[PDB]
Amino acid sequence: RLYRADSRPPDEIKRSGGLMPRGHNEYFDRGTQMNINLYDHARGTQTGFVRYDDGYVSTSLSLRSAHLAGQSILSGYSTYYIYVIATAPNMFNVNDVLGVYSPHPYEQEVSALGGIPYSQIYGWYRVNFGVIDERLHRNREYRDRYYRNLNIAPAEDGYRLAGFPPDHQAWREEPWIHHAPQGCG
Amino acid sequence: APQTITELCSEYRNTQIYTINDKILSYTESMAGKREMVIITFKSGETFQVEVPGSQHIDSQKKAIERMKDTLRITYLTETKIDKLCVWNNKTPNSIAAISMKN
Amino acid sequence: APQTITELCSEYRNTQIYTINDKILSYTESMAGKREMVIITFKSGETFQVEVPGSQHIDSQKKAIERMKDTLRITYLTETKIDKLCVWNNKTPNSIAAISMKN
Amino acid sequence: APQTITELCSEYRNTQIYTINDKILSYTESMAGKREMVIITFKSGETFQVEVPGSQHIDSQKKAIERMKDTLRITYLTETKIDKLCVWNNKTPNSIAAISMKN
Amino acid sequence: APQTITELCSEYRNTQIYTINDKILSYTESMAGKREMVIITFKSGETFQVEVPGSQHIDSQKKAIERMKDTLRITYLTETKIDKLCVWNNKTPNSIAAISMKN
Amino acid sequence: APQTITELCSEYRNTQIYTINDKILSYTESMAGKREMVIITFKSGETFQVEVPGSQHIDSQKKAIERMKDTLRITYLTETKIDKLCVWNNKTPNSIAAISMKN
Amino acid sequence: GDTCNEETQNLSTIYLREYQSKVKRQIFSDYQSEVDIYNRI
């Protein structure tokens, strides 16, 4: 599973249809041409939020990594939650897709294109004064059978989606050359 | 006029309440002649059927047999937990007379 | 025609509105002969049935009875919130005449 | 045949097109004798019905009435926006003749 | 019997395959008398209909027209892409004879 | 009665169990006269059909053919893995007699 | 040039639209109720 600390409460997440990128109102909302760019997302920082701009929502590979980021960004919050998320092909491993151009490689983030739907959230832990209450609340709307097999998108499918500016050296080198969009490199 | 599946189940000869409290493990549906039935199994290893339509079944029961097969398919697909089953224990596999689901 | 469930409930004798505002707590479906019915319960403590069709029912109500059992199975499986119930309270359990859901 | 809901609606006398562009606010479903109908309303305050099968209906319309009640229940539950409604405006609530949705 | 929609469509006079590979953009459904039909459009500008059951419809096709309208309603609501359509080109809008979807 | 699909299948002539353990790749649905059928394929290359309600079908079988088509559309749309198919192997494409789904 | 960033936003939205339809196929199918076609016809 993947983990993300966030101050938006479970009921706010249900009402929006999931963990939304910055500015995106609810999950199926087509009423805004949202900029979606992995390179841009991976280099951004938002105060009070683990990276969630430029159409992606960042997550961590472990509960401990999610709490560390949670305590760096949301410190002193009387409450925040760590959501436990199933792997599915809307998720991309940032290091794998951006390679040597990955901006925070030590972070080991896995980012979800367009946000994480509410049915993809397996459950959440409440974090009080920075201490994780270890009782996981399960999301009864989680679709167990569907997400049970699924895994993150292979890097091969995200190279075309990396979003490096047209002039970036990456578009002229391996592996992105072989997946370069029209007008890049 | 029963208010619960135990009440209802006790009105017939040869019935038994089963507490399952689990979701369906497998669903089988046959359209093979003389065997137009649905068989469901549980992790418990318990097997149940919705019996084939036949001349002994009055049209009210014919519509209710088709409703029960609809209920078992969407229960399996939604992974919904079944609480109890009232069955005719006189057949193999035991035939469903009624189903309850809680929560 | 009436325009709300409270207006429609008022045209019938032996009816009352229950404000539920909650999802169904349990769902029981029977295909046992002569008691092919659905029974639903809520956390508030009330039990309601969809009556076995018979001859208190015009042919028009027979399609409608089947539709109501379809609606109650979906609202139960999906934890959809029911707003109000119009029921005939001269039956045990009280019998459903109409249902409303508000978004 | 017509290609749009407006072209369809104007082949009939006493019809009107409503632009809704919104999801359904409440759904009421009745199995009460002689009032077997569905009523839907919008946050605008507009109320519409799928009328009771009756004499004004040709034989072919009866399966189309049942399909329309099926479309309105799944549209309400999935919160899909309705684009426009073609309604008969000679009765209250106005009665639905056709519905369009666009994605 | 045919193994694909192209093979099946070839068995008929006045049909043509359209490769759509896109989701339905709008869905219209009518219960108005003599126009009990569904119309669907695509962002390409193409419009297709499921025709009113009629004189040139053998009775096995009647239960299949009904199924096709149900398939089109849920394909539209889930935004599933239609791959190909086999259509009769001697009707305006062209009339749907078969549908395929993959993945 | 049988308690398993391999044992239900075992009892007819010209049947074959196929272990699939995969979701459906494509679904084709036809309402063309005399080709009112569903064809499903798997990525492995297997194509199976639900036969056109022919003469060798009893009426219990008419309703069961309709149910099987309903199951295959909902299985395709929800991408549910099919475990095994019992098929008549003297038809081309092989014709479905029963399906099982597990977990 | 501008094509590289438009193309990126465009291949990203198509990948998103397709995953959103899989999600609607999961959650909306819970609402799909089968019709007895023989009875209604």
Curated annotation (Swiss-Prot), chain A:
<comment type="similarity">
    <text>Belongs to the enterotoxin A family.</text>
</comment>
<dbReference type="GO" id="GO:0090729">
    <property type="term" value="F:toxin activity"/>
</dbReference>
<dbReference type="GO" id="GO:0005615">
    <property type="term" value="C:extracellular space"/>
</dbReference>
<feature type="active site">
    <location>
        <position position="109"/>
    </location>
</feature>
<keyword id="KW-0843">Virulence</keyword>
<comment type="subunit">
    <text>Heterohexamer of one A chain and of five B chains.</text>
</comment>
<feature type="binding site">
    <location>
        <begin position="4"/>
        <end position="18"/>
    </location>
    <ligand>
        <name>NAD(+)</name>
    </ligand>
</feature>
<protein>
    <recommendedName>
        <fullName>Heat-labile enterotoxin A chain</fullName>
    </recommendedName>
</protein>
<keyword id="KW-0800">Toxin</keyword>
<keyword id="KW-1015">Disulfide bond</keyword>
<keyword id="KW-0260">Enterotoxin</keyword>
<keyword id="KW-0732">Signal</keyword>
<comment type="function">
    <text>The biological activity of the toxin is produced by the A chain, which activates intracellular adenyl cyclase.</text>
</comment>
Swiss-Prot record, chains B, C, D, E, F:
<protein>
    <recommendedName>
        <fullName>Heat-labile enterotoxin B chain</fullName>
    </recommendedName>
</protein>
<comment type="function">
    <text>The biological activity of the toxin is produced by the A chain, which activates intracellular adenyl cyclase.</text>
</comment>
<dbReference type="GO" id="GO:0005576">
    <property type="term" value="C:extracellular region"/>
</dbReference>
<dbReference type="GO" id="GO:0031640">
    <property type="term" value="P:killing of cells of another organism"/>
</dbReference>
<keyword id="KW-1015">Disulfide bond</keyword>
<comment type="subunit">
    <text>Heterohexamer of one A chain and of five B chains.</text>
</comment>
<keyword id="KW-0260">Enterotoxin</keyword>
<dbReference type="GO" id="GO:0090729">
    <property type="term" value="F:toxin activity"/>
</dbReference>
<keyword id="KW-0843">Virulence</keyword>
<feature type="disulfide bond">
    <location>
        <begin position="9"/>
        <end position="86"/>
    </location>
</feature>
<keyword id="KW-0800">Toxin</keyword>
<keyword id="KW-0732">Signal</keyword>
From Swiss-Prot, chain G:
<comment type="function">
    <text>The biological activity of the toxin is produced by the A chain, which activates intracellular adenyl cyclase.</text>
</comment>
<protein>
    <recommendedName>
        <fullName>Heat-labile enterotoxin A chain</fullName>
    </recommendedName>
</protein>
<comment type="similarity">
    <text>Belongs to the enterotoxin A family.</text>
</comment>
<comment type="subunit">
    <text>Heterohexamer of one A chain and of five B chains.</text>
</comment>
